[PDB]
């Protein structure tokens, strides 16, 4: 059977407004391996997102890191949108800099 992804959205370095950084969305614990991940800026899909090569944990579940350069601001909203066979609808998880 199947396992739904865990999702975490966070920055590579501690977020400081106006300072360039990297926005990460880490999906893990899922099976099977096909998965769709987008990073959003104020609801719109960010274009040039990269990701790590498919690998898996000791329990066989897959994990991937999706990331892109970004410069955090006070008002800009960032999020990660994930769809997987386990999800009836894409799951959106917002970036919270305390998380």
């Amino acid at each position: 059977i199947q396992r739904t992804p865990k999702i975490q959205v966070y920055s590579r370095h501690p977020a400081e407004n106006g300072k360039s950084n990297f926005l990460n969305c880490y999906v893990s614990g899922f099976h099977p391996s096909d998965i769709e991940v987008d990073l959003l800026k104020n609801g719109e899909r960010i274009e040039k997102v990269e990701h790590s090569d498919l690998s898996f944990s000791k329990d066989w579940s897959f994990y991937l890191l999706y990331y892109t350069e970004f410069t955090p601001t006070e008002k800009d909203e960032y999020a990660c949108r994930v769809n997987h066979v386990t999800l009836s609808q894409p799951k959106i998880v917002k970036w919270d800099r305390d998380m």
Partner: protein
């Protein structure tokens, strides 16, 4: 410290969408160093860490031969397993394999591993004796008979005790400035009111390598296992990892709580509290 090498193979059928995809990635500890993807425009083994780049053309050619062969072989294996489980040709299925060797802090072989899964469930695994198999069901028993006839276990034992360790030790030397460097976590405690009389203490560990870490909260010196929210350790994207542990505490009782941090990079284990 202790070190390991692992290869992770994922072979995935996709009926109606071409032949099964084969991916292989190689790791030393938490550092990936090669990849091969049969879906790539021109499939070849590619370096993924600076210290492997010095390997010669023959290394890259040999790797690519092996992974191309695997690509073909896994396509047959996927067909085989479909049949073993009387499955329809319509579904997508996955075989995963992870194998490699572990060294102890003195650099000698601790143990070898070769484990396979089908659709995310244990399928067949080489036992720690590197001589016998554990098959998960009657389907895997068919694989076992085949592999015994091909002397697969004997061939893996030779690799695991020989080349696997030799190469791992070579990589450890070539990448010593990073692979043999433990980076300790940078830690802090944050405080977030969740109500008039509860607040969240969150204990942060950032920038550490390798990923193995222990993060706990104690109240009056007593573990708060059930009450602690623990996120999965996550990659920062610069080789390092991050983790936090959170506990919700009665307002005013903050000083009864201590965060404890264990990591290989730490001269001394850490005890942290919220510092208003």
């Amino acid at each position: 410290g202790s070190h390991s090498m692992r290869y992770f193979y994922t072979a995935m059928s996709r009926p109606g969408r071409g032949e099964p995809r084969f991916i292989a990635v190689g790791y030393v500890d938490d550092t990936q160093f090669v990849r091969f993807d049969s879906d790539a425009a021109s499939p070849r083994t590619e370096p993924r860490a600076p210290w492997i780049e010095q390997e010669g053309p023959e290394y890259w050619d040999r790797n690519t031969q092996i992974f191309k062969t695997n690509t073909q072989t896994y396509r047959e294996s996927l067909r085989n397993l479909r049949g073993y489980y009387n499955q329809s040709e319509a579904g997508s299925h996955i075989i995963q394999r992870m194998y490699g060797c572990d060294l102890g802090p003195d650099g000698r072989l601790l143990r070898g591993h070769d484990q396979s899964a089908y659709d995310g469930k244990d399928y067949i695994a080489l036992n720690e004796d590197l001589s016998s198999w554990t098959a998960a069901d009657t389907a895997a028993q068919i694989t076992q008979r085949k592999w015994e006839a091909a002397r697969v276990a004997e061939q893996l034992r030779a690799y695991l005790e020989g080349l696997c360790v030799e190469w791992l030790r070579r990589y450890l030397e070539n990448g010593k400035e990073t692979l043999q460097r433990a980076d300790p976590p940078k830690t802090h405690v944050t405080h977030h009111p969740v109500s008039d009389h509860e607040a969240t203490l969150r204990c942060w560990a950032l920038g550490f390598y390798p990923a193995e870490i222990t993060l706990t909260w104690q109240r009056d010196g007593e573990d708060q296992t059930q009450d602690t929210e623990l996120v999965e350790t996550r990659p920062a994207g610069d080789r390092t990892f991050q983790k936090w542990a959170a506990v919700v505490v009665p307002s005013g009782e903050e000083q009864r709580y201590t965060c404890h941090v264990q990591h290989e990079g730490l001269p001394k284990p850490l005890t942290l509290r919220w510092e208003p």
